Structure formats: structure tokens, C-alpha cells
Amino acid sequence: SMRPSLSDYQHVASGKVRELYRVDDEHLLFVATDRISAFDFVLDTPIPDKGRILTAMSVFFFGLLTVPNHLAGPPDDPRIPEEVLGRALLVRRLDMLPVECVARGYLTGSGLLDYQRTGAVCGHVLPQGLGEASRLDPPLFTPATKADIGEHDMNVDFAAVVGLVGAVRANQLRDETIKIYTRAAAHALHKGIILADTKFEFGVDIEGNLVLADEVFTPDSSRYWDAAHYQPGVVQDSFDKQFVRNWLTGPESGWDRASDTPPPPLPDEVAVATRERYIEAYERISGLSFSDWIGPS
Ligand SMILES: Nc1ncnc2c1ncn2[C@@H]1O[C@H](COP(=O)(O)OP(=O)(O)OP(=O)(O)O)[C@@H](O)[C@H]1O
Ligand SMILES: [Mg+2]
């Protein structure tokens, strides 16, 4: 249990709810936090154990899939500081590809909106008559690129991906994205949870291999829905975040989402209920017990 301090590692970067540290020239520490985002705001109130639960989830899916991934040691690797144990992974440093590899099995969000405006999504001209939460058969590769800080990603088509990473690599990204999405979506649905869409971040290792990195198939990287009352044609509830969304936009919060100003803190009971939803998604899909996952509660 002798472990380095987080302060022993250089802070490299990161986004809203995760952190990245340099361990050495070829390894990083990939840290999930308990912070949660809703309506594109990072909320004041952390969700207890969220970082650990989502790390456990990513680790499960990395083990399920047979494709190369960025894991470089066990979840209890001694290079991991105690203060992030269970919510941090020792990973291989990759050259990240500048494209968001999104797979959509169902039509919602910007995919639906692009379809309603144009009849197409990311260069895919779709059948007429689709709508909110329609199943996409087959699932779509719907790549995007990151835009300015704070604003939504830009949907692009396959030709744009070719110009970003090369023709052969673009085809490789497309094929792998669809393959692993299809497998994971079937696995989750078998247990009563729909993986509506998901985003992969790929990088390339020293050998030129395509490597799956960042987070995979978590509620932060994906839209999860409860299959039990999946109803094409209406907006589906977020499996994990609906209690948060309902409280924020309900009569008790005092917050108007349309104001586009930072939301107030959550009730502790809502945070704990949300924690339980994350655990439920993890346990149902993985078939493992979160009580066995490492790290402090
Ligand atoms: N194995 C890896 N090697 C190198 N960089 C990585 C690796 N895994 C993830 N990253 C990168 O680290 C950066 C920070 O990670 P983080 O998940 O916070 O980014 P993000 O997904 O863009 O965040 P957000 O979705 O909140 O905007 C990302 O640009 C991601 O591509
Ligand atoms: Mg982040």
C-alpha cells in the first residue's frame, strides 16, 4: 500500500470531469472524478463513487472486447496514488487521433436534428419516416470533431475523417467503431439496457497500432436507456441522469434551464439515488459486484 502521491506526477491536461497525469515518457494516469455534467454544466454536487463506478465499467468493457486498448497495468497498480485508487488507470501514452468516433444505434440528439433538417446524418442518407428514438438499422458511424471550448462537437462525414487521419485509417476507424458498438449494444440490451449511442477516442501507439483509449461505454461516453419501456417516438429517459435532470428542471430547484446560467447544487438524496443508478447499470451489464471494486467508498 506504499503508493506515490498525485503531486509526484505532472498534470498533463484534461476536460470537464476527468484528469490526465504524466507517469513517465510512455505512461499516463487516467483519472475519473465524481463530478457530473448535466445540460452541459458541471454540477456543484459530486456523485459519490461515480469515478470509481465508471472506471470499473470501462475496465469491464476493455476486458470484454478483444481490440487493443490503452490499459498498461492492473487497477491496483502500485503507481496509482491512494487518493484516486479505483478511479484511475495506468495507461499507455498514445498519439490521439483528432476525431470523435461516434456510433449511433438510435436516432436522437444532433443525429435526429440533422436528419430532420436534411434527411441525412454525417453523410448517411436515411429512410424517410424516422423520428425520435428510432432504431437505426444498421447502426451508423457518425464522426464528429471537437469545436471551441464549451460548444458542441461538429458532425462530419467519412470524407472529412479521411482528410483528418488518412483513407486506410479512416476505414479502420469506421469498421472498428461499428464492430465494437454492435457487440457492446447487444450485450447491454440482453440485460435490459439500451446503448443508444457511444463515443470512442482512439490513439496510435509507437508501432502504428490503432488503440482504444479514454473511457469506453460509460454513461459519460454513451447514452444509456432502460429497455423495459423503450418507446420509439418519444424522448427516452436517461438511465443514470434522469433524477438529476428532473430535479433541476422541476419545481424545487428554482432554476430555469433556459436561462443558460449555472445550475444550483443537487439534493444529497438525488446524488445518492444517481449513485445507485450507476451501480445498477454497472452490475447489470458487467455481471460483477461493485462491492468487489477496489478503492475507498
Ligand atoms: N491513452 C491516452 N493517451 C493519450 N491521451 C489520452 C489517452 N486517453 C485519453 N487521452 C486524452 O486525454 C485528454 C483528456 O481526457 P478527457 O477524457 O478529459 O477528455 P475529453 O473526453 O475531451 O473530456 P470531455 O469529454 O469532458 O470534454 C483527451 O484529449 C483524451 O483524448
Ligand atoms: Mg473530462
Swiss-Prot record:
Please name the GO terms that the record assigns under molecular function.
ATP binding; phosphoribosylaminoimidazolesuccinocarboxamide synthase activity
The record's CDD domains line, in alphabetical order, gives: SAICAR_synt_Sc (cd01414)
Key word ATP-binding present: yes
- Please indicate if the UniProt record lists ATP-binding as a keyword: yes
Q: Which GO biological-process labels does this protein carry?
A: 'de novo' IMP biosynthetic process
Enzyme Commission identifier(s): 6.3.2.6
Its pathway, per UniProt, is: Purine metabolism; IMP biosynthesis via de novo pathway; 5-amino-1-(5-phospho-D-ribosyl)imidazole-4-carboxamide from 5-amino-1-(5-phospho-D-ribosyl)imidazole-4-carboxylate: step 1/2
Q: Which GO terms describe its cellular component?
A: cytoplasm
Q: Which UniProt keywords apply?
A: ATP-binding, Ligase, Nucleotide-binding, Purine biosynthesis
Catalytic reaction annotation: 5-amino-1-(5-phospho-D-ribosyl)imidazole-4-carboxylate + L-aspartate + ATP = (2S)-2-[5-amino-1-(5-phospho-beta-D-ribosyl)imidazole-4-carboxamido]succinate + ADP + phosphate + 2 H(+)
Say which domain of life the source belongs to. Bacteria
Assigned protein family: Belongs to the SAICAR synthetase family.
Q: Which PANTHER family match?
A: PHOSPHORIBOSYLAMINOIMIDAZOLE-SUCCINOCARBOXAMIDE SYNTHASE
Q: Which NCBIfam families match?
A: PRK13961.1, purC
The protein depicted here goes by the name Phosphoribosylaminoimidazole-succinocarboxamide synthase
Q: Which organism is it from?
A: Mycobacteroides abscessus (strain ATCC 19977 / DSM 44196 / CCUG 20993 / CIP 104536 / JCM 13569 / NCTC 13031 / TMC 1543 / L948)
The organism that produces this protein has a lineage beginning with: Bacteria, Bacillati, Actinomycetota, Actinomycetes, Mycobacteriales
